[PDB]
């Protein structure tokens, strides 16, 4: 069947070649870029103790949570540098973090395979864990809250799982990946999501149907972190192959290959600005790269850190970009 | 101050959060996290039983072993429920104090060689040094001295090797035990460059100095980490 299913996977590469009329770089040859823009660190968020594995923004655009691998989830007042909460975790190796759109909840997704959903807005002042989502048989590489009582979570098992915090059990288990799914990004319409994996394939998923809608290949290495383009019809994935790839939903191709030849380090984070014109990756050379997501130019470097940039996020209002790295510090850019 | 009243205590909470974090820093910086990378059929599952019982969930990926020896806390972190692809969960341990890569020297090992070769020349596990910690010597000498049917046809460089200068053991076992040591060091000192130095040992189920073999060779990393800050070493 391996030679029999190869032509059907070759049916995808020529159905995508049938739509391959003109590239995004050929389309956007007549649109003026953002140019070499200065972007400066506004708040250095000192206070962690270890490598900041992943941060996430509130949808309130101000509350920032970050996962550092010291056993500390810290919720930041990012506007005033204040630490809104610090959460002593049980899993000291937390790989990822997810702030709820409601803002009541936060997830640490440990290396220990629990998505400890912490309830921030308790009647108690303590941030107790509401549902340590045990399961998922692999390092919890990403998680993204859909609602207050529904989270989708990525695993080191080659399988993403949609959970229910009020129950405590994975309602859906998205099991299309052949390699460890390293990240996960929910759609703006929160009815799809995307998941980039160590199988070099980013798989589009339906959250309700549980089905692999499209599998986006084209990356040469393990897709380290992923984010949706904010109109929900595209996403850029960032692999270890140092080449970010903007794929298009309902098109099954890669549009822009954000490849600079002087960059060989892995793209360990990806975020999209509110326009989706300014895609700002978090590379492993201790700097970001605010790519023009249409012109595919470098268009801005965020060199604020000493160690590899593990996590970018642009706010829902698009105003800040927090940036955590493998030091104790989160730089907030503009 | 120009801060409001509920923002005056939003800092006074945040300062008391930092006061907890500067208390958690003393707990973090005075405790030495140790990755523990024994493979299948190795001795990892009993060394985390040995180091725990000497001194202090159904699919949990990390088992934390908190052992203190000479009154300094260590956290051995063997990696349980994660699958065989170590590519990405091993990056998370770039700021550990050591990597206790436990080896089945009894079995035949090239998988343990090619694992240690990848753990050494990894871009994130370079500048952190493996405590090589060769376990199961009671059955390693049984595979050479007592049994002798486990001869080294797997390893063609055994015929061109003899124990150079090394410490009641048989001379054919001590040649073998210091070849298993020498097989890793041919993949350790090749791409070490002084940033991280492998600290090998020999262990068993009845070792009982296994945690002291960590701490005395974990001192030898933090010493060598600080000597590299003085450009001394």
């Amino acid at each position, epitope marked *: 069947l391996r030679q029999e299913a190869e032509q059907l996977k070759n049916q995808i590469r020529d159905a995508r070649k049938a739509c391959a009329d003109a590239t995004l770089s050929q389309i956007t040859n007549n649109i003026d870029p953002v140019g070499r823009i200065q972007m400066r660190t506004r708040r250095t968020l000192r206070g962690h103790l270890a490598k900041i594995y992943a941060m996430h923004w509130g949808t309130d655009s101000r509350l920032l949570v970050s996962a550092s691998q010291d056993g500390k989830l810290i919720i930041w007042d990012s506007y005033t540098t204040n630490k809104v909460h610090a959460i002593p975790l049980r899993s000291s190796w937390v790989m990822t973090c997810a702030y709820a759109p409601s803002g009541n909840y936060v997830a640490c997704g440990g290396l220990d395979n629990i998505c400890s959903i912490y309830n921030l807005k308790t009647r*108690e*002042g303590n941030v107790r864990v509401s549902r340590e989502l045990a399961g998922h048989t692999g390092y919890l590489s990403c998680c993204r809250f859909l609602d207050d009582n529904q989270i989708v979570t990525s695993s080191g098992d080659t399988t993403c799982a949609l959970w229910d915090i009020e129950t405590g059990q994975q309602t859906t288990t998205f099991t299309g990946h052949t390699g460890d799914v390293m990240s996960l990004s929910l759609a703006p319409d929160t009815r799809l999501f995307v998941s980039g994996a160590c199988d070099a394939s980013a798989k589009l998923w339906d959250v309700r149907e549980g089905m692999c809608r499209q599998t986006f290949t084209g990356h040469e290495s393990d897709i380290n972190a992923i984010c949706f383009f904010p109109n929900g019809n595209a996403f850029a994935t960032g692999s270890d192959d140092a080449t970010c790839r903007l794929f298009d939903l309902r098109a099954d191709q890669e549009l822009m290959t954000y490849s600079h030849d002087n960059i060989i380090c892995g793209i360990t984070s990806v975020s999209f600005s509110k326009s989706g014109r300014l895609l700002l990756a978090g590379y492993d050379d201790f700097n970001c790269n605010v790519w023009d997501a249409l012109k595919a130019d470098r268009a801005g470097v965020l060199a604020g850190h000493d160690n590899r940039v593990s996590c970018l996020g642009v706010t829902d209002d698009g105003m800040a970009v927090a940036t955590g790295s493998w030091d104790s510090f989160l730089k907030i850019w503009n | 101050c120009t*801060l409001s*009243a509920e*923002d005056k205590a939003a800092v*006074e909470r945040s300062k008391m959060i930092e006061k907890q974090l500067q208390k958690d820093k003393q707990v973090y910086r005075a405790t030495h996290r140790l990755l523990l990378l024994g493979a299948d059929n190795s001795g990892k599952s009993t060394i985390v039983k040995q180091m725990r019982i000497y001194h202090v969930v159904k699919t949990s990926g990390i088992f934390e072993t908190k052992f203190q020896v000479d009154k300094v806390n260590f956290h051995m972190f063997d990696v349980g429920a994660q699958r065989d692809e170590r590519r990405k969960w091993i990056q998370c341990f770039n700021d550990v104090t050591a990597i206790i890569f436990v080896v089945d020297s009894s079995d035949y090992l090239q998988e343990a060689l090619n694992d240690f070769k990848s753990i050494w020349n990894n871009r994130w596990l370079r500048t952190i040094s493996v405590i090589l910690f060769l376990n199961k010597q009671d059955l390693l000498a049984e595979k050479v001295l007592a049994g002798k049917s486990k001869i080294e046809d797997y390893f063609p460089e055994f015929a061109r090797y003899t124990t150079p200068e090394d410490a009641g053991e048989d001379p054919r076992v001590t040649r073998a035990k210091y070849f298993i040591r020498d097989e890793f060091l041919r993949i350790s000192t090749a791409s070490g460059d002084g940033r991280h130095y492998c600290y090998p040992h020999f262990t068993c189920s009845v070792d009982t100095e296994n945690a002291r073999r960590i701490f005395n060779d974990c001192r030898d990393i933090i010493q060598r980490m600080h000597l590299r800050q003085y450009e001394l070493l």
Partner: single-chain antibody, 222 residues
């Protein structure tokens, strides 16, 4: 969450009794703790404050030296070591939970109160089922602060028990969505949409910029 009080009343004039707030059901070490008066012929006024820890302990100017406050965080209790209990130190003293961060709801849980008896912003308002009403509290100074929102806190109070936070124009989670708040820095109104048998009782508007906290007599709904 039970902020029950261990203190007592019937104090001599000039007496120096300590008033206890035994906190339970929450991370009391992570809470800014207050003390709020209620004279039997008047409304709420504020006494004291400790934040989380011991930094920024505040007081009203009427109790700046006579009343002192000190929390016992291992013993999980708050003390008000009052001294020289005189006239106008008679109040149903309400120990108040209040946590301060962005998006927080401070002043959101209240002690049952100790009926203690003896043998700046000067904001106030008017005194006053199924229909919409309004309250229209006015301030002394603008509260917009050019950094956040306006720091006015709506406290509905059922007549035979402790008060409770309504709006810290943000609705508290323990009170229903019929309540609403609006304002423009100086004039603030609490627009209940359909009042019921819980909404009957005195309302209160406390500022939170200048740390002397005043409430006003409030619309005693009947």
């Amino acid at each position: 969450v039970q902020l029950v009080e261990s203190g007592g009343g019937l104090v001599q004039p000039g007496g120096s009794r300590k008033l206890s707030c035994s906190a339970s059901g929450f991370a009391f070490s992570s809470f800014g703790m207050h003390w709020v008066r209620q004279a039997p012929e008047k409304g709420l006024e504020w006494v004291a404050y400790i934040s989380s820890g011991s930094g920024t302990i505040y007081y009203a100017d009427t109790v700046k030296g006579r009343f002192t406050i000190s929390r016992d965080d291992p013993k999980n209790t708050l003390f008000l070591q009052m001294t020289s209990l005189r006239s106008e130190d008679t109040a149903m003293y309400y120990c108040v939970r209040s946590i301060y961060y962005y998006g927080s709801s401070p002043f959101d849980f209240w002690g049952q109160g100790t009926t203690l008896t003896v043998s700046d912003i000067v904001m106030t308002q008017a005194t006053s089922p199924g229909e919409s009403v309004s309250i229209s509290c006015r301030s002394s100074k603008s509260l917009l602060h050019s950094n956040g929102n306006t720091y006015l806190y709506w406290f509905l109070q059922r007549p035979g028990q402790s008060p409770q936070l309504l709006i810290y124009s943000n609705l508290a989670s323990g009170v229903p969505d019929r309540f609403s708040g609006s304002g423009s820095g100086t004039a603030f109104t609490l627009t209940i949409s359909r009042l019921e048998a819980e909404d009957v009782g005195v309302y209160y508007c406390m500022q939170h910029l200048e740390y002397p906290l005043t409430f006003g007599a409030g619309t005693k709904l009947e």
